Symmetry: C3
Subunit: 104 residues, 3 copies
């Protein structure tokens, strides 16, 4: 199993969600994060006064499906412009379904 994580432009969330569902991928979770590009001095130190909003999507997928999921996310999240973001795949050592306690 692999954890697929992607940092995408907020307005691309629905396209990515649609792409994943079409593949029959379930279990996506999303949250807001911030990136940086615009600074102001306060008490001798520099403070960022502007941020770029992003959405972080995370979904666990089988070894046999992850490459297809990664390709699908990339195609859906792409604009070609600055700030499009990244997709990272991490190996999962163990996964548990909380509802039943089943492992792997």
């Amino acid at each position: 199993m692999k954890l697929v994580m992607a940092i995408i432009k907020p307005f691309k969330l629905d396209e990515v969600r649609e792409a994943l569902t079409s593949l029959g991928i379930q279990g996506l979770t999303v949250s807001e994060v911030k990136g940086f590009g615009q600074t102001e001095i306060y008490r001798g130190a520099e403070y960022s006064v502007s941020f770029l909003p992003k959405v972080k999507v995370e979904v666990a997928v089988s070894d046999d499906q992850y490459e297809q999921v990664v390709e699908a996310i990339q195609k859906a999240a792409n604009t070609g412009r600055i700030g499009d973001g990244k997709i990272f795949v991490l190996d999962i050592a163990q996964a548990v379904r909380i509802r039943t306690g089943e492992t792997n």
Copy 2:
């Protein structure tokens, strides 16, 4: 070392926290994320207008303790009903204590 991550129902957070403390596990962090189940068309595209609130808990645990921690989280977070979520274990390659700079 292992990073244990769990996506749980929000009302289960306190049970999970209690379970972990009873094991003497410290260093839990939590944040809100969203899952999906309820769509509306805007400018020709489908937009989700409803979400399922979840809580993501993350805690680093030793190789000798992680299986016990995973079992404890599962038991505490379980309802048996739809939406109970998942627990993922990821291998940590290096860990640093910021307070002292100690590694591993």
Copy 3:
């Protein structure tokens, strides 16, 4: 490639950001999370009524740079006092640049 994740005190975010930029590291994202230290009984159960705010920073870095980045984050985020947090390095199995579709 490695994913470097750090849970730091919120007031240390700008120092960490400055340290990383000085190294020429790009692609940092940040979000708020909560840790725990202060409980109240509601319907027979214990509820936490206080939390410690933290910031979670995540950045992907090359194998050749990660140790330097980890050292830099630790030095910048350190106060020496309780609650300073942790840095975790996770192996990345695959990375994709969404803007161009390039892999690794």
